[PDB]
Ligand SMILES: *[C@@H]1O[C@H](CO[C@H]2O[C@@H](C)[C@@H](O)[C@@H](O)[C@@H]2O)[C@@H](O[C@@H]2O[C@H](CO)[C@@H](O[C@@H]3O[C@H](CO[C@H]4O[C@H](CO)[C@@H](O)[C@H](O)[C@@H]4O)[C@@H](O)[C@H](O[C@H]4O[C@H](CO)[C@@H](O)[C@H](O)[C@@H]4O)[C@@H]3O)[C@H](O)[C@H]2NC(C)=O)[C@H](O[C@H]2O[C@@H](C)[C@@H](O)[C@@H](O)[C@@H]2O)[C@H]1NC(C)=O
Ligand SMILES: *[C@@H]1O[C@H](CO)[C@@H](O[C@@H]2O[C@H](CO)[C@@H](O[C@@H]3O[C@H](CO[C@H]4O[C@H](CO)[C@@H](O)[C@H](O)[C@@H]4O)[C@@H](O)[C@H](O[C@H]4O[C@H](CO)[C@@H](O)[C@H](O)[C@@H]4O)[C@@H]3O)[C@H](O)[C@H]2NC(C)=O)[C@H](O)[C@H]1NC(C)=O
Ligand SMILES: *[C@@H]1O[C@H](CO)[C@@H](O[C@@H]2O[C@H](CO)[C@@H](O[C@@H]3O[C@H](CO[C@H]4O[C@H](CO)[C@@H](O)[C@H](O)[C@@H]4O)[C@@H](O)[C@H](O[C@H]4O[C@H](CO)[C@@H](O)[C@H](O)[C@@H]4O)[C@@H]3O)[C@H](O)[C@H]2NC(C)=O)[C@H](O)[C@H]1NC(C)=O
């Protein structure tokens with residue numbers, strides 16, 4: 001049980017593969033850091049957890065509430081995941097073996113587009129994460 | 138007569154006993170796990186979660202939730218209610234004696250429960266609904282609220298609370314019973330509730346006094362206001378409060394629903410009321426932008442007004458925008474309920490089992506502290522132990538301070554999830 005390579009949430013990251021997204025195979029007990037990088041120019045993001053249907057349709061339902069809201073460019077904002085049952089998260093955010101979790105953002109990257117529900121960098125720049133837990137290739 | 142014994146339990150109170158009131162590098166808590174009280178499950182897929190424990194007058198009430206492949210309280214098929222006694226086994230330490238266990242009649246419909254032990258009997262206050270989303274899209278007239286009560290000898294009687302006859306101090310569409318426990322003072326029960334309201338009726342002076350980085354394009358006032366909104370339905374606000382219930386032999390109820398003081402409001406989260414040191418303590422979990430311990434003794438009932446500790450050391454983990462030690466106003470949700478028990482007034486001392494981590498839920502450490510500094514601490518396990526909730530109660534057993542804590546633990550990865558109970562002693566010497 002170890003620390004996976006950190007994932008910076010931004011267009012610059014190579015690990016998002018066009019049409020696919022970032023795909024990971026963490027095992028229960030592992031850590032992963034998702035980071036909203038601080039700063040001449042800045043991207044504004046609201047990062048969410050969704051199921052497959054919504055990840056494919058690149059849409060967020062109104063009830064959802066984000067893991068990360070990065071509206072603050074002057075500071076680094078970090079979300080540390082350990083894959084296990086219990087997290088301080090309000091929804092319960094549980095990680096069980098042999099289950100899949102999707103992380104997307106529908107946002108333009110512009111401050112005016114931070115609250116955008118549909119499309120966004122999920123749809124265009126392919127910012128999506130698929131975490132297959134307790135599984136491998 | 139050889140059948141008689143003096144009671145080994147007393148409420149921790151009165152002239153301070155002698156124990157370690159200052160810093161200590163390696164304290165001896167005499168920490169022992171109590172594994173015989175809480176049931177064990179044959180099906181490893183059953184998850185026992187969300188433990189609740191109230192100790193009063195030598196007797197205790199335990200509650201937990203059972204659900205399949207789900208540790209969420211909402212997915213629970215069965216909710217377990219336990220009554221018991223605190224006893225001297227000659228162990229040189231307090232013991233839990235389990236008298237009764239029953240499952241809630243309405244378990245499939247249970248939204249939330251809070252225990253209180255009163256007059257040596259267990260009472261449980263429950264919010265029941267045919268609608269799992271009832272706090273988001275519904276109102277309290279559509280739901281039911283019950284008091285289940287029992288003891289060692291008697292079989293459980295569960296009676297319905299005439300909510301129709303209640304009087305509220307504000308206009309609330311909904312409320313739930315939420316927290317680690319309530320109290321009884323005279324003929325009155327007082328139970329922690331989280332209330333729902335449709336209009337922003339609230340002032341945030343405290344929140345507005347902060348100066349630090351906020352989300353661009355948004356005013357501080359906007360943030361402080363919007364931070365009390367249910368993240369599920371932005372048209373609703375969640376405000377903590379209490380329900381006061383008067384009764385005569387479980388008949389002739391008089392019920393009042395009051396909201397908490399508007400001084401330093403925090404987003405509605407599970408709270409607790411407990412009797413200690415001759416006072417009454419209110420605790421509130423920190424589920425929003427202010428991540429430091431939120432607690433205080435109750436200086437006024439109407440409005441319900443705890444005098445908030447100003448505590449610069451104790452905090453809680455959460456992931457993302459408001460991790461541990463984050464004091465800047467934001468719209469963010471999360472955290473862990475880890476309540477506290479007072480040790481000594483004069484020295485302003487408290488125990489709590491707290492999670493030592495910035496983000497992850499793990500590493501419970503028994504911590505003894507004042508507002509300013511941590512006096513002493515010990516990890517509960519030498520191995521990484523995934524734990525979410527924690528509760529702690531304290532009392533005098535044989536004229537010394539003793540504590541019992543329940544931890545909501547996942548020890549074996551993802552399977553046979555069961556909470557752990559612990560008893561431990563406050564060090565006499567540093
Ligand atoms: C809420 O806090 C923020 C930020 O936190 C501040 O907290 C205090 C406790 C200090 O620690 C402070 O340093 C923090 O920044 C605050 O906004 C900032 O306020 C500070 C002052 O408190 C201010 O810093 C100043 O910057 C000056 C810039 O001058 C430039 O030009 C000169 C030559 O002309 C050049 O040499 C400089 O390098 C700059 O390029 C600077 O001159 C000052 O330096 C002196 O003071 C320090 C501190 O004592 C001393 O150690 C040095 O030796 C110098 O003698 C000074 O540090 C910073 O610019 C503010 N940030 C902004 C504007 O973005 C808020 O207060 C401020 O609010 C508005 C009204 C602003 O106009 C400030 O006057 C005001 O103080 C604070 N909010 C409230 C309501 O108080
Ligand atoms: C939260 O809890 C902390 C810890 O319990 C309290 O802080 C302590 O307060 C006591 C006084 O009430 C302090 O005692 C003091 O000790 C000094 C010697 O220690 C110095 O050196 C250490 C290094 O080991 C430094 O860390 C420390 O800051 C000191 O500078 C003496 O100068 C004094 O002792 C005097 O009183 C005693 C009786 O108590 C006499 O017997 C002595 O002869 C002498 O006259 C001084 O009183 C202690 O240092 C503090 N510890 C800290 C700050 O870590 C907080 O007060 C408490 N918070 C609140 C809000 O109550
Ligand atoms: C976010 O939170 C808001 C605010 O609470 C919720 O909006 C409420 O939704 C409930 C039901 O979903 C509404 O309850 C209904 O009230 C009707 C009359 O009151 C108002 O209804 C309209 C609806 O928009 C208002 O605009 C208007 O001002 C009226 O004054 C009742 O007639 C309804 O009767 C229901 O129950 C009977 C049984 O008793 C059934 O026979 C009926 O078919 C019906 O189901 C009902 O009780 C409530 O009025 C709404 N309040 C508002 C809009 O302020 C949102 O639901 C919530 N959103 C989410 C996603 O959870």
Ligand SMILES: *[C@@H]1O[C@H](CO)[C@@H](O[C@@H]2O[C@H](CO)[C@@H](O[C@@H]3O[C@H](CO[C@H]4O[C@H](CO)[C@@H](O)[C@H](O)[C@@H]4O)[C@@H](O)[C@H](O[C@H]4O[C@H](CO)[C@@H](O)[C@H](O)[C@@H]4O)[C@@H]3O)[C@H](O)[C@H]2NC(C)=O)[C@H](O)[C@H]1NC(C)=O
Pocket residue numbers: 433444445446447
């Ligand atoms: C966390 O931090 C907060 C912020 O400081 C503390 O709150 C202060 O607490 C002190 C002590 O309890 C309070 O001081 C008392 O004020 C009384 C008058 O209060 C006035 O305050 C409001 C302002 O909001 C006025 O508008 C209003 O009209 C009130 O009249 C005094 O009468 C008290 O005198 C006491 O001290 C003397 C000592 O010489 C005794 O002889 C007296 O008999 C009496 O006991 C007292 O000074 C102060 O008001 C609070 N400030 C606030 C709330 O902003 C919290 O107490 C602290 N938390 C903890 C747990 O300590």
Ligand SMILES: *[C@@H]1O[C@H](CO)[C@@H](O[C@@H]2O[C@H](CO)[C@@H](O[C@@H]3O[C@H](CO)[C@@H](O)[C@H](O)[C@@H]3O)[C@H](O)[C@H]2NC(C)=O)[C@H](O)[C@H]1NC(C)=O
Pocket residue numbers: 255256321323324384385386
């Ligand atoms: C727990 O025990 C306490 C005390 O042992 C119980 O308090 C009792 O509450 C009853 C109400 O049911 C009180 O009776 C009332 O007395 C007033 C006079 O002040 C009278 O005018 C009313 O009509 C009413 O009859 C009773 O006095 C009080 N006992 C004491 C000693 O104060 C409490 O009810 C118990 N809780 C339970 C059993 O849940």
Ligand SMILES: *[C@@H]1O[C@H](CO[C@H]2O[C@@H](C)[C@@H](O)[C@@H](O)[C@@H]2O)[C@@H](O[C@@H]2O[C@H](CO)[C@@H](O)[C@H](O)[C@H]2NC(C)=O)[C@H](O)[C@H]1NC(C)=O
Pocket residue numbers: 265266267279280281
């Ligand atoms: C929750 O709903 C029940 C009715 O539905 C029950 O039966 C099945 C359909 C199944 O969904 C089961 O889980 C569920 O509990 C309510 O009981 C009835 O409510 C109607 C309302 O008009 C009354 O007319 C009935 O008499 C009553 N049945 C009785 C009293 O036996 C129940 O009241 C409701 N509870 C809450 C808190 O809303």
Ligand SMILES: *[C@@H]1O[C@H](CO)[C@@H](O)[C@H](O)[C@H]1NC(C)=O
Pocket residue numbers: 385386388
């Ligand atoms: C009060 O409770 C006792 C308990 O057994 C019962 O015997 C008695 O009839 C009750 N009286 C009233 C007025 O409720």
